[PDB]
């Protein structure tokens, strides 16, 4: 809010700022657009499904073990072990939970509006589309979910990449063991790695640093005797204070302009990444992708997205030809 | 005698009177650079009565303030002298303490040495001619005894005259056990501030010469070793980044002009 | 308020931010130190032996209530120009310490003493720093400092080896070398006495008559303040929003007995916003914590203007168990406060909601709010209802290791993808 | 310029001119970002034309919802509107598979 | 156009101005901050003595 | 700084400095948008590869 | 570098600019981000193997 | 360097300035807006009476 951030509860400074024109209604409109754009980004990425699916009460998928990616009721947030791990990995700064010291410092009108989709229904979206993709394959990405057995779906995915069903139906135990081992070790890799969620951590830290720099900009004399309006208005006289306060204001307004200009570019980048993630969901999650090196490395089989703080994390399941042998061809 | 030493990390005070907590605030001021040269000085006076004469007193430059550190039994070092040109041609300072008193003057003092015939007055000036300013009140230094000499008190003083307001930043750290300037970090706070109006580039100190002890004599110079138990260091304009503890004190500060890492 | 903050008589469905709400102060508290001994200013101003410029007399001011309005009858006051501190409301300020420097100069150099001024006196006898806060008083003293023969009682230096730093004195009787030619107290040719006669005659015109000048130096830098104006100290109040005026530092906020540990030389405190967070009560030496009023944003949730005139106000990030309900005339800036704050109260993680009631049912949500809550217009008989957003139609599949579902008929559907490809080209 | 005099009119004009110039800078900066967004959308629409319009797209949920058949674009003011023709499996029946 | 005529002391001839605080500028004649117009001042010691 | 004196030299310097700083702001703002475009093109080229 | 581009080797101008706050550390951070972003663009486009 | 000397009345001693309009500043001696240099003024009532 320009009034508070620029002239803290000072009537004369509010009158001095009112003459600047519609120079902050536009500022409010820009940030409101950014907020609704973030809400639209999240809803477009995750709400690709019309109906919320539930996993079967029994969990048999032909040896396949989805325990690490399916939600567990024991935890109170209804998130998968890997999903919860992502949340623990990202040290969230603020979320707007009625805070009434860095965030509490911001009695400067810098408030963080909580997202529309709380991280108890984003997890619901992820679980619903996980049930869709592990019980109906790609069929639920087109119309009604078509219930098909998981070994059948996997053989169909193999047929998608020119391997035929017989390979899967002759190696199903090996494939199930390999998938379980990969799902087990991906959590260990995420936990023991120095920093894998670097993109999400940078997304949080960039906004935190921008807000911190805005707060720190409140003391720049900008060519004034002091950076405190109350002391200026107790010390000087209205006419001399007029220019002095106005000089401090134009400086502060330019500082806020810089913040909103950087936020516009950052939001454009985040929208580009959200569009990429939405296309990734629609292609990799809701079916096999023939695009090479798009959904992971190697030939793609399927993907499982996981709820993450200010982002989404995909678990691309890929077919790698592994060890090979030379032959003679004609 | 005279000898050199390494200041390690020491001589950091509170530039401002604003309370901070978990703040990484940085500021630039006349700060003692870390890992700099600090020069010992000693006033040999054990054969003064058997002729000989002390003959051991230089005129320490004052440029951009002086950092002070010493360990006296009770009151061995009492005061300092500032000013320039010595003679009545120009003014001088007469900071000197006694019991629970401090008297400082900006009067044109002409002198030659730094005695006071006490353990009184005089012997340290001969001209109360055109004196300008006078000051009294509580002394800078409050002695505390641990009932033994093991807990040697360290009296860290930093002197500044930027537009008057003489800086007497002082602190007591009796945790010393014998090592010269032990490794560690301490904050430093002012006591008094008052302008004097004088071009100061000379600095000297007062010693209780009427009864002195433990003053070995040697020809140590040019980065040698010698027991002096009296420290002097010069400040230079330096940017300092200071970490304020959660309680509000200073835990550690880093220089901005010493190493690339800093 | 919404129709005003967005210039339109028509407002459609959506949540709009309008302004904030601040708890107005009840009274103003002043805690200037309890001093009464008026410091001697008459002795400084109205004197008969004003020192020469080369040896300006510097006078210290200690604990006192100094009224900068009874000095207007002490001097002619030819010019009372002042720097960053203005003499108008100068009696409402608290100084750490005040210094007055008095001397006499010529008329053409009465404006020469100033920050960053270069010449004879301002460079060799009395230099004021660029950051100097305080101001200079100058008035003509021709009637007193006039001599028919010669007023050979004032001096000023002319020759120095180099420049002079601000706020010091170069009172010295030596011989200027004025070249490699060496002189020893002779004061002969090539070696001139730095102080030369500054005689005054009444016959001299403007710009040469003596100008007795006293310049007051202030240090209002946030620090233990002593010299203070004649402002009556009021009683101290805690846990209530007031307009504090602690030692000339004004502001608005609630004051609580703080657990700070201000060292004896510390007076004001600082957070990482470079604004005062804690203060020391000078009349009590007790530490007070400054936290602003229980502010917050205000968002108006309304349907289309041609659907109803009833809106739902949602306050940003504030529990509706403290200030949102607390309201009085001239106590909160939003005067639209006719909303009951006791009927239709929806506590939300995005701050509580006023005007809408919770519905256990979940539908597709029209007006976003936050934290999985959206308000919408529903027929009971029409009112705004805030609910939890419905994620989608609940559905279950019948996964079986041997069962399969396969379509037997199809439906051809045509959708629309509206994709902008260009905007309005323009040139300014 | 009719009221003031050049000496102080200059600085007044300078203050007005820098304010107005910064106002125009803000508009141009916003237009740059909006044009970058519009170019992103135009690149998306061009890829959509090249894939959906000029052939079948095997990408799922790219050219409409459901399995894609073809598309017909339509000119729109400052944009393009696609008419994606999609195959939806509609009603289904359960069976037994091995 | 409005003209206001009075007499004041020398040290307060600059005291009448938008936003000036003191004795006369606060208690006898105060000019608003947005005041447009200007003040004419000249010594009248020869007549008002 | 050779011609004027600190009092007015500072405000003159302040005006020049804010003008030059805003000029550098313009360059940095344009570079941010250009780098966002170049990153979009680089992502397109990476997918193309 | 703001210091050199803005106040060419002038101590008083550097002191004047220092008061402007963290108004150029942010400028340095933006361009360092652009540089590392260009390096990442090139490495992501080409180092697919 | 060019020095121009003349005599004027007291009320018009400040009239000789860049962009000042009146009787002398418009009809007898006008200084340009971009004028660099400065004006020296002192009373000569004792001689020119
Ligand atoms: C410390 O030494 C000073 C001189 O160096 C002495 O000051 C005397 O203080 C008493 C206090 O009432 C006065 O009556 C004397 O007139 C002071 N003497 C002089 C020469 O000024 C004294 O020895 C100590 N200061 C004190 C006790 O305040
Ligand atoms: C410093 O003190 C001496 C003490 O005598 C002063 O010496 C004489 O002071 C009288 C004052 O009426 C002068 O008329 C003499 O010319 C001085 N004799 C000299 C300087 O040899 C001296 O004036 C004092 N200095 C200052 C700057 O006050
Ligand atoms: C300076 O202080 C003296 C007191 O020492 C005062 O002198 C008075 O001046 C007025 C004006 O001429 C006379 O009417 C009074 O009779 C004087 N009183 C005394 C006791 O002398 C006055 O405050 C100041 N005087 C001047 C000339 O500035
Ligand atoms: C400089 O000027 C003052 C005023 O002329 C001088 O007068 C004495 O100042 C002291 C304070 O130090 C007072 O206690 C005396 O009452 C003043 N008058 C006399 C006759 O002594 C004094 O020399 C200087 N003031 C300072 C240095 O503060
Ligand atoms: C303090 O006074 C001393 C007096 O010796 C000054 O030292 C002289 O300074 C001038 C001007 O820079 C030069 O001639 C020499 O540097 C010194 N002269 C001699 C003979 O040593 C010193 O500069 C003064 N301090 C200040 C800050 O002005
Ligand atoms: C807001 O209300 C909830 C529910 O009573 C409470 O748990 C929470 O602590 C309140 N907020 C604050 C800042 O006390
Ligand atoms: C200290 O000074 C001595 C000689 O003056 C020199 O040999 C030594 O290297 C210096 N040490 C430091 C750390 O400056
Ligand atoms: C810091 O404060 C805590 C709690 O107020 C206290 O227990 C601790 O002793 C303090 N540390 C100090 C004074 O060094
Ligand atoms: C006056 O203030 C002092 C502190 O400076 C202290 O004695 C007390 O707060 C007050 N005493 C009286 C009697 O008003
Ligand atoms: C508003 O709604 C009313 C009834 O719902 C309708 O008659 C009227 O035309 C609408 N006006 C607009 C501008 O939509
Ligand atoms: C909503 O659900 C719970 C109990 O099921 C309780 O808050 C309340 O009785 C319900 N409200 C309505 C309107 O059913
Ligand atoms: C699939 O087989 C497992 C293991 O026998 C069983 O628990 C599960 O209910 C079966 N699912 C169906 C519905 O055929």
Numbering used by the authors:
A (entry chain C): 737 to 836, 849 to 1078
B (entry chain C): 25 to 143, 155 to 297
C (entry chain B): 298 to 677, 689 to 736
D (entry chain B): 981 to 1078
E (entry chain A), H (entry chain C): 395 to 443
F (entry chain A): 981 to 1029
G (entry chain A): 737 to 785
Task: Paste lines from the article.
The dense glycan shield consisting of 22–23 N-glycosylation sequons per protomer is an essential feature of SARS-CoV-2 S architecture. The glycans have been shown to play intrinsic and extrinsic roles in protein folding, modulating conformational activation and immune evasion. The transition to the ‘up’ state exposures of RBD for the binding to hACE2 is also a prerequisite for S-mediated viral fusion, directly correlating with infectivity. Here, we dissected the role of N354-linked glycosylation, acquired by BA.2.86 sub-lineages, as a RBD conformational control element in attenuating viral infectivity.
To further verify the role of N354 glycosylation in modulating RBD up/down disposition, four additional modified constructs, BA.2.86-T356K, predicted to remove glycosylation at N354, XBB.1.5-K356T and BA.2.75-K356T, predicted to acquire N354 glycan, together with BA.2.86-ins483V as a control, were characterized, and their structural features were compared with the ancestral strain. Thus, we performed all assays under the same condition by using three representative variants (BA.2.86, BA.2.75, and XBB.1.5) with strict controls (loss and gain of N354 glycan). We observed that N354 glycosylation dramatically increased the proportion of the ‘closed’ form from 19% to 79% in BA.2.86, 50% to 75% in BA.2.75, and 45% to 90% in XBB.1.5, making the ‘closed’ form the dominant population. Notably, the N354 glycan resides in a cleft formed by the NTD and RBD from two neighboring subunits, and establishes hydrogen bonds with T167 of NTD and with E340 of RBD, respectively, acting like a ‘bolt’ to lock the S-trimer in an ‘RBD-down’ state. For this, three paired groups of six variants (BA.2.75/BA.2.75.5; XBB.1.5/XBB.1.5.44; BA.2.86/BA.2.86-T356K) were carefully selected due to the only difference being the presence of N354 glycosylation or not in their RBDs. Surface plasmon resonance (SPR) results demonstrated that RBDs with or without the N354 glycosylation showed comparable binding affinities to hACE2, indicating that the N354 glycosylation does not impact hACE2 binding. Coincidentally, the N354 glycosylation (K356T mutation) first emerged in BA.2.75.5 and then in XBB.1.5.44, but they did not display growth advantages compared to the prevalent variants, presumably due to the dramatically reduced infectivity.
